Amino acid sequence: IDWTLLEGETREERTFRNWMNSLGVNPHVNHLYADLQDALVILQLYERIKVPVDWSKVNKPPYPKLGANMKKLENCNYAVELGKHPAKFSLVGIGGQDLNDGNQTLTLALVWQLMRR
Amino acid sequence: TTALVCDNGSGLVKAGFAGDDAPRAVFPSIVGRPRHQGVMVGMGQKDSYVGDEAQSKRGILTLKYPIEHGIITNWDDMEKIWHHTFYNELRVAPEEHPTLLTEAPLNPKANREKMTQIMFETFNVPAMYVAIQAVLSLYASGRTTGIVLDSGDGVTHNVPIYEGYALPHAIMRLDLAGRDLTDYLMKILTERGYSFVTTAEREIVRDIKEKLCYVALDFENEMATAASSSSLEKSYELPDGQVITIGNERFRCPETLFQPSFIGMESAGIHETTYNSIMKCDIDIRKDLYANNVMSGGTTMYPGIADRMQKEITALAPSTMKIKIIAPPERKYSVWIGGSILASLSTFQQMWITKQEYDEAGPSIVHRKC
Amino acid sequence: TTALVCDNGSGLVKAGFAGDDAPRAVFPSIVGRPRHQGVMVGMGQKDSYVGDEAQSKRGILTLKYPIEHGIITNWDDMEKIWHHTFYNELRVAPEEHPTLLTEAPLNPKANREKMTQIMFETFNVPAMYVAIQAVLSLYASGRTTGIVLDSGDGVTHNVPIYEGYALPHAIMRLDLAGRDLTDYLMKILTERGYSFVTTAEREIVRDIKEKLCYVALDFENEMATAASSSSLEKSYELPDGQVITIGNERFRCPETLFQPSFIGMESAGIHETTYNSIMKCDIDIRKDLYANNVMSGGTTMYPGIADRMQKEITALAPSTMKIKIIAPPERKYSVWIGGSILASLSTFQQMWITKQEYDEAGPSIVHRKC
Amino acid sequence: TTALVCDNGSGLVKAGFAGDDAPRAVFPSIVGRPRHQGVMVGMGQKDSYVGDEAQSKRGILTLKYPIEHGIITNWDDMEKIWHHTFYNELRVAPEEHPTLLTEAPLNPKANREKMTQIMFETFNVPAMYVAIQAVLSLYASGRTTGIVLDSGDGVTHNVPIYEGYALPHAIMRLDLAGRDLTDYLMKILTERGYSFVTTAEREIVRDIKEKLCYVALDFENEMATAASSSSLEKSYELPDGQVITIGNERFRCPETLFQPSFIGMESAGIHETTYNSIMKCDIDIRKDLYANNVMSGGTTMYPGIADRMQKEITALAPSTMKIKIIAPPERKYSVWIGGSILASLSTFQQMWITKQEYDEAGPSIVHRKC
Ligand SMILES: Nc1ncnc2c1ncn2[C@@H]1O[C@H](COP(=O)(O)OP(=O)(O)O)[C@@H](O)[C@H]1O
Ligand SMILES: Nc1ncnc2c1ncn2[C@@H]1O[C@H](COP(=O)(O)OP(=O)(O)O)[C@@H](O)[C@H]1O
Ligand SMILES: Nc1ncnc2c1ncn2[C@@H]1O[C@H](COP(=O)(O)OP(=O)(O)O)[C@@H](O)[C@H]1O
Ligand SMILES: [Mg+2]
Ligand SMILES: [Mg+2]
Numbered sequence A: 001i002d003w004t005l006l007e008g009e010t011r012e013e014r015t016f017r018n019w020m021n022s023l024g025v026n027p028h029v030n031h032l033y034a035d036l037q038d039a040l041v042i043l044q045l046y047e048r049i050k051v052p053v054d055w056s057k058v059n060k061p062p063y064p065k066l067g068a069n070m071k072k073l074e075n076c077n078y079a080v081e082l083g084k085h086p087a088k089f090s091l092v093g094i095g096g097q098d099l100n101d102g103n104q105t106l107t108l109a110l111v112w113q114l115m116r117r
Numbered sequence B, C, D: 001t002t003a004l005v006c007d008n009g010s011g012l013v014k015a016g017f018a019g020d021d022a023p024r025a026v027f028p029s030i031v032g033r034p035r036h037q038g039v040m041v042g043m044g045q046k047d048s049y050v051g052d053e054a055q056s057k058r059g060i061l062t063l064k065y066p067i068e069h070g071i072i073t074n075w076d077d078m079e080k081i082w083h084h085t086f087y088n089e090l091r092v093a094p095e096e097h098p099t100l101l102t103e104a105p106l107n108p109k110a111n112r113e114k115m116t117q118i119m120f121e122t123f124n125v126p127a128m129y130v131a132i133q134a135v136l137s138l139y140a141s142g143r144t145t146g147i148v149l150d151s152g153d154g155v156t157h158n159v160p161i162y163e164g165y166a167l168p169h170a171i172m173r174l175d176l177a178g179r180d181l182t183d184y185l186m187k188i189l190t191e192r193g194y195s196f197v198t199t200a201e202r203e204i205v206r207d208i209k210e211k212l213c214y215v216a217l218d219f220e221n222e223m224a225t226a227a228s229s230s231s232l233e234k235s236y237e238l239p240d241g242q243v244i245t246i247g248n249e250r251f252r253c254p255e256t257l258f259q260p261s262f263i264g265m266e267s268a269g270i271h272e273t274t275y276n277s278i279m280k281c282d283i284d285i286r287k288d289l290y291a292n293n294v295m296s297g298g299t300t301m302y303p304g305i306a307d308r309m310q311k312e313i314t315a316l317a318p319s320t321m322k323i324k325i326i327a328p329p330e331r332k333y334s335v336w337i338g339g340s341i342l343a344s345l346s347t348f349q350q351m352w353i354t355k356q357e358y359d360e361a362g363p364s365i366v367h368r369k370c
């Protein structure tokens, strides 16, 4: 199992990464703000906190070279929508573009709450 | 249960945990909404911008301050702002952390009651307390006797304290602070051809404040120097690459504090305000109040403010005993530091407004418990 | 089933299916009719020529560009062109394919209304949507912020976009494009003794322009190079065997883009138009607008156009910050690529103008939905 | 001798003599230069067109407005305009007649200093003075208490005055006037297929706006009337014989005054600006300020502007107090009438900025004397 200290990383982000790695995410999350931009890992974490996910609305990791950014933004928007209504999260001012652009504050605000559930 | 110390001011929001020496979250208290039209799909899902996202995308957003002159105008917005503070910035559950919030003196009671009701019925904390910003600023300085001039974004007030005893009859409140200074700066920038109207440009004007404005020790001498020479001219670069230069408005804006008539106000200067506050106190305690002048707030960050305070008060002094001005480098977070110190005290643990007291006394319990 | 993406331009028509990376059908937007007398029986049964058959038989036909400056002049002609595109080029029945078409900004509303009414009432499609060519250009580049310089055969326009939010007040349209450049080359070709009057010869001169014309980085020294030397001379062979030579008209023709006064036009160059469009936006978004300049269309195919564009903007820049312009090689089909991307999006399927919406709201539903 | 009262506005120049009831010279403030090639000898001796000769020959001239939003940008053009209005329009020597000009509030000081230097050095008039347009508007109405909302061609500003005392802190300037309305009308005219892009066509668009636009009492009811019935359509004939018809753009153009978001501006409507200005004043004088709402300028010539103004203030009024609108028929020349009245006063003869005051104090004497 990977137990290493990065050059720049708080203990909170290390706990986040270790939690998602130990929970069995399909990719290997090495950076929080560089691997969650596609919102696929967030969707994978969603069913493990008993939040149903409709995979027919999810774009697969194979992305066409045209409109891939639009597909990733759609995935982030769907993840936010799934977290809001049926999941009852407190995410004020957080949108799909924030997760797509890797906003650290709003991404940490979502992951720590995911471990809360 | 680590107590929360959230000092939400008119301009900035200061939040953190009791025991820390510095707030963990310092973001402007703004709510941003788009004013343009989005053409592509998948991006217009966000309706409001609360934290620094409003500051970053301010070009396509309109900025509104939910707190005006230490008085709430838009109660819907603090729900968003407080949820942001609790979940995005601090990332803690309010239901487990009792939160200490601050309030300016001579604030209408409905504000405090509605704020207590909102925070209890939405965030469901175990307990609460409301402390005055000036008292916390004295807690940060480790004093029990003195007069604190708290000048933040909307409220400038003086609170004299002697041996831990306050004098409400000697406490006043001046609604002249950094926001009015920014308004004056925008008004006077049109003299050089620099026009700023949109709310986004107000942030640039506040940046010009914080990078170019200073308090003149002698106003007429600085006018003479600016009119005769050109050494006071300073250049500022706009975000789009344009460069503006100001040499006189640097000290004209902060002088509105000493000369409220600059924005057409009949009030006197802050030095005169604190002198009158001390005159409202006992003659036996005026000696200690002159020797303890503690500053706080972002408005006290102009260069030369402390020397001008000393000069003006000594001019108003009986000319026999010395004047002491205290301007710690942590003035902007003195209220938060004092709140953290107070919430960390074991004696203060019995002063919290527990939820069972609220459930039986309504929002009015804060009036008797604070 | 699948969405049709057809870019009905003034000169060329780009058509295909959603999800494709390039339009399937690209033929000139012309309508050809005979202008001679048939003497042998068996060839006069064809009344009009729509696709490439008009171009191939142009020696005995008159060529009409029905779409002029992105404005519809002859509705029966685009009826024929759309029937051709749907049945002979794409060979798909419109009644089961929702079709996404493109439209230039600052286009009269009657155009969009009549086009919506016609294509629902003639082609009986289930749904429609109308996208902007500049928006689809940014879709092709995969960008959400920047100003688009789309210059096709009829319309050159700029649309500033920051975080996807467009500024209608900063959007302006210029009616100078490749057709006007071909006409100016026609006007300046008579200096060397080359005369072309027939609309068939218009396509020949357009072909000459698409091959020998280029944008000069510096125009006045190119004047000296062409007048003093012969290295800029280039030869083109006419279809009937004759060969013409142009050395100065190669780069004088594209200069009308930056010098509209060549044709007696009072408007400014494309660089100045882009500069004014950026300056009409918010100061905070101007940095990103400069940092993202997208050009598109077949008119942007002249060699050296991007270098001249960046040099002119840098001269117009505040000289402190950086300028770069995106010049992809799919510029001629960027609008179609963006249309395919948009129509392929799952979330875009809800904004198709359903035929039941049309049947109850008239042709005016297209204004509310687009 | 006789003082000269010249109102150098953004769009029109009003000139005459002190004491007169109407200006003697009213010509557009434009400078025209040829934009074509002269091929017949003996006609190209004229290079600049200042007065109505620029308006009459605009088909071959480029029209430039020297004044932009009441701010001076081209100094040679206004020197030509002043020479014209002094020697051909009024045909009087400036060196003998003191000249009284007007100036908008929140105008950069360099403008006033340079203009003062110009008319002490180019025309070297014996005396001069600079007064605010709003003050002259109150002088024309014969009032000493009230708020003045002046809207000309470049500047719209509110100036409240109580018993002859002005309140600078309640004065703000909005850069939205007839020129911006003409630009908006041109922008919305392309919806009907009417395109006018040259500077000569700008005057035609302005003429159409003047003779066909009106202020809607209720904007949404007018939307419904225009979209339902055709009684709002009106016809205008172009100089070449073409006739255009507009039914909805008539009242969409003036609505931008109350809805600046039409042109993408974050500012509020003129009614809200006046409400804020009155609220920025003392509550004791607000009673007289509301009952004295004096407007002036060519922008106040739209039909129904007074009724909409009254309705908006009444909606913004405390609902218990009376509002009065003053819209004299001489609003377009109210500034000039007030200037003539002031310069005809015997008491005003001592505030003239004499030549000797300038010769000792530089151009800065105007700031002290005005
Ligand atoms: N370096 C500075 N110089 C001058 N003024 C400042 C500076 N920093 C902040 N301010 C002013 O103080 C305000 C914030 O002060 P603060 O103590 O945060 O007020 P509040 O607690 O009411 O939000 C800012 O909005 C600005 O107007
Ligand atoms: N390599 C080239 N050099 C110069 N001009 C070109 C080149 N390729 C295309 N063009 C011009 O661009 C035009 C194509 O514009 P287009 O994008 O098809 O307009 P629309 O989008 O309205 O159909 C043609 O008329 C042609 O004159
Ligand atoms: N009857 C009218 N209806 C609508 N607009 C008008 C009318 N008359 C004049 N205007 C507009 O008012 C403007 C006149 O501005 P003006 O008051 O002359 O400015 P200044 O006072 O700065 O010279 C013109 O630009 C014109 O477009
Ligand atoms: Mg504070
Ligand atoms: Mg095109």
Ligand SMILES: [Mg+2]
Residues within 6 Å of the ligand: D009, D133, D150, D151, D152, D153, D297, D335
């Ligand atoms: Mg005027």
